[PDB]
Amino acid sequence: APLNAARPAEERAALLAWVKERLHEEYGDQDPTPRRDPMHELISTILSQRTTHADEEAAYQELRTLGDWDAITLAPTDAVAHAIRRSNYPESKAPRIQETLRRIKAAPGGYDLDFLRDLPVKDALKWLTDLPGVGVKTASLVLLFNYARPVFPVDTHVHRVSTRVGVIPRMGEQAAHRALLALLPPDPPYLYELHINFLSHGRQVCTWTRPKCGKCILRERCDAYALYGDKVPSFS
Numbered sequence: 001a002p003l004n005a006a007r008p009a010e011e012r013a014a015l016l017a018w019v020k021e022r023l024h025e026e027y028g029d030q031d032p033t034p035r036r037d038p039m040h041e042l043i044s045t046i047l048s049q050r051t052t053h054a055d056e057e058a059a060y061q062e063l064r065t066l067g068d069w070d071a072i073t074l075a076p077t078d079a080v081a082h083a084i085r086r087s088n089y090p091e092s093k094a095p096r097i098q099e100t101l102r103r104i105k106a107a108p109g110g111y112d113l114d115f116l117r118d119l120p121v122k123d124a125l126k127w128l129t130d131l132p133g134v135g136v137k138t139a140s141l142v143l144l145f146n147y148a149r150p151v152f153p154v155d156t157h158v159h160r161v162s163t164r165v166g167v168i169p170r171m172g173e174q175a176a177h178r179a180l181l182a183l184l185p186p187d188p189p190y191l192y193e194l195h196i197n198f199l200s201h202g203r204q205v206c207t208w209t210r211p212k213c214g215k216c217i218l219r220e221r222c223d224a225y226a227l228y229g230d231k232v233p234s235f236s
């Protein structure tokens with residue numbers, strides 16, 4: 001009885017489809033994601049590095065007391081750094097923020113990302129990942145949620161559950177974006193549902209340490225449980 005992670009890609013694709021339907025039954029349309037507008041998501045992402053969620057939100061709102069995006073680009077960089085002093089390493093984040101705001105404005109439209117809607121997906125991804133402090137996960141999240149493009153964001157919860165089950169073998173988070181999207185239909189609502197139900201599952205059941213496999217609807221087809229039973233180790 002071979003592990004899932006060794007099976008042909010067409011079999012691991014069918015497995016991920018079975019996972020998708022079981023997780024939909026458990027969580028329906030619960031949505032734990034912040035669901036921000038694009039500009040807010042990008043800047044929050046930059047602020048979030050090595051920073052708690054509470055610290056991130058406070059730093060963002062404090063940033064916005066400096067004014068609209070125009071004033072923030074024009075503000076002295078020391079003034080920005082002081083505004084975001086609740087987040088970690090404010091001095092290094094202050095200019096990544098201004099850089100990104102400057103590049104956004106220069107693009108067609110104002111402080112808007114609506115031009116991305118009409119670009120080829122690969123090009124749209126690249127434009128976003130080129131932005132300072134923006135990774136492939138946030139780039140994918142913005143494109144899927146805000147502009148309904150067929151890309152699939154892989155956060156720590158999606159990575160952990162899909163690797164434990166054995167949909168993919170062990171690999172880095174960025175490579176897992178390529179690998180998991182290759183197993184999925186180009187269907188944005190389908191991708192969104194799968195993303196958020198993974199989030200709910202990783203938070204409530206398939207946790208970082210001591211997962212609750214006895215309460216898990218995926219148990220009978222999970223590689224990690226087959227290997228370790230009740231003693232699945234912590235994910236890394």
Ligand code: SF4
Nearest residue numbers: 206211213216219222
């Ligand atoms: S059986 Fe355990 S390790 Fe496997 S997906 Fe469920 S909670 Fe995670």
Ligand SMILES: [Mg+2]
Nearest residue numbers: 105107109110
């Ligand atoms: Mg613009």
Ligand SMILES: [Mg+2]
Nearest residue numbers: 129130131134
């Ligand atoms: Mg980048």
